[PDB]
Design a protein around this ligand. Structure first.
Ligand code: HEM
Lengths: 218, 148
């Protein structure tokens, strides 16, 4: 798991399956324009929501700074009782319900319960991983670790190496690593000069030599 | 105003309630003395455990350095297969079961998860507070660079 992609878990096929059609009722729909803030840290309302379509960004903010914790994709699930901002990275539709209502849904359908535990588990491991990087690694090592994990989760093997379509620019990467867009640009170039990668565009990378990158991040 | 439900009680109370008696059996009890290392990022067994009594320090380690994440007390829940080491800070007792059993429990008794999430939430809150503190420090980044 990474800050760019949480879980391969399929919470949409469930909410559209055989048994599940009365619980979808108990979900309200809301749609958001790109860059719209879905939720603020001091939301008075406490909800559980899932991304039906699009892509949202969970982040911390302080003065003029931000740090991206996670990107939520279709299928992913979250709450509103967090200190984090939640923003549409694109035109997004969520499905939400008040927490008390969600607490009722979990017992009528154990698959939600089991999903919500697997997601919390991974979230737990992701947060320990962010902290570990912030405490003991430099930006270069955090990037190397980010690439290596991103490759394992979503890399596509091609003849030239592993294709990584991040859907993120250098600035969006910088916000996930806690650095500037400038130092990220420098670091990708260093990796390029090492034979590790090239850029395919502003959003995708070619990992020509993953083992040398694995060997770098340790 | 609502009545108090099992969903609002601590994990131990629930576990030691009559309908969860066949659940408590799933857990095996283990006892550790002050300063013992329960688990490392290397522990091969994938297990979920809760503190029955005592307390447990969760920390990251690197080379000769440690970074403490949290102290877990009675009622708290954790797992192996994280970055973290886990060390008893006093004589402690835990209940553990295998990740497969815990999932069977969560599916047989889906409301148990609601109690699980409530405790887990406190730990997540805690870890996000750490993240906030690490990412938004000012000029002390290169001044505490001379401290260490
Ligand atoms: C899969 C869905 C959920 C996810 C991904 C999630 C995630 C999180 C995260 C990241 C935090 C950190 C809090 C912070 O910002 O400081 C948190 C806090 C918390 N969560 Fe959730 N949550 C979910 C559903 C629920 C549910 C159903 C409950 C049941 C009531 C719950 C109860 C809590 C509580 C009680 C806190 C701490 C706040 C307090 O009461 O003092 N969460 N959650």
């Amino acid at each position: 798991a990474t800050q760019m992609r949480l879980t391969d878990t399929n919470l949409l096929e469930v909410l559209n399956s055989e048994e599940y059609s009365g619980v979808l009722k108990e979900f309200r729909e809301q749609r958001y324009s790109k860059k719209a803030i879905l939720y603020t840290p001091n939301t008075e309302r406490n909800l559980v929501f899932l991304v039906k379509s699009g892509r949202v960004r969970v982040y911390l903010a302080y003065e003029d700074k931000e740090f991206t914790l996670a990107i939520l994709e279709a299928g992913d699930i979250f709450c509103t009782h967090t200190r984090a901002f939640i923003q549409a990275m694109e035109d997004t539709t969520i499905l939400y319900t008040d927490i008390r209502n969600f607490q009722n849904i979990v017992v009528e359908f154990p698959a939600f319960s089991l999903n919500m535990v697997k997601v919390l588990g991974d979230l737990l491991k992701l947060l320990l991983t962010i902290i570990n990087g912030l405490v003991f690694k430099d930006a270069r090592l955090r990037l190397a670790e980010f690439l290596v994990q991103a490759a394992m989760d979503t890399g596509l093997k091609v003849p030239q190496g592993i294709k990584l379509e991040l859907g993120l620019n250098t600035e969006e990467i910088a916000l996930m690593l806690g650095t500037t867009r400038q130092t990220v640009s420098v670091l990708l170039n260093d990796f390029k000069k090492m034979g590790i990668l090239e850029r395919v565009n502003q959003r995708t990378l070619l990992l020509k030599d993953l083992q040398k990158l694995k060997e770098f991040s340790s």
